[PDB]
Amino acid sequence: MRVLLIHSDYIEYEVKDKALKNPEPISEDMKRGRMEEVLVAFISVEKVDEKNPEEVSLKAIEEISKVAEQVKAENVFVYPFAHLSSELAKPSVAMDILNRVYQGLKERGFNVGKAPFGYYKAFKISCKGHPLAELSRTIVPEE
């Protein structure tokens, strides 16, 4: 799994066209959303993660939170992102890992937001541009 953590003044999106045959069904409220003083996490679930989803989700949860501490971010937004990896994971496994992380983040006490999986979204992001405001992580299962 490949993560891109960007501490933003805000993140905002809008669901345009579908990018898959069967994207995550969403209710009206999810068609768009906005989060402020947030740590944005663009995540590319990779094929190797299909071996051990739990270890990879739990591992990513601990690494996202750690950084949410460092930058004193109270809100974390999970952004399903397909362009951080070449070897992407099967759509079904991606959604699953992303939910695991989303949920596991919610139970850590963070206000968590999320962009709907499987769609093309337009979006605005404002990176704070500080020393630790931009990080990248790799979370892969152990053999």
Ligand X SMILES: Nc1ncnc2c1ncn2[C@@H]1O[C@H](COS(=O)(=O)NC(=O)[C@@H](N)CO)[C@@H](O)[C@H]1O
How near is the Cβ of 79 to a second copy at its closest, in Å?
11
Q: What is the DSSP pairing of strand 32-44 with strand 134-138?
A: unpaired
Residue 94 interacts, among ligand X, a second copy, none and using kind-specific CB cut-offs from 5 to 8 Å, with ligand X
In sequence order, which residues have a C-beta less than 8 Å from that of residue 24 and are 6 or more positions away? 95, 116, 117, 118, 119
Beta bridge partner(s), residue 33: 13
CB-nearer residue toward a second copy: 19 or 103: 19
Contact residues: a second copy, CB under 8 A: 4, 13-14, 16-17, 19, 82-84, 86, 120-131, 133-136, 138
The Cα–Cα gap between 95 and 117 comes to 7
Where do contacts with ligand X occur on this chain (CB under 6 A)?
19-20, 44-45, 80-82, 88-89, 91, 94, 117-118
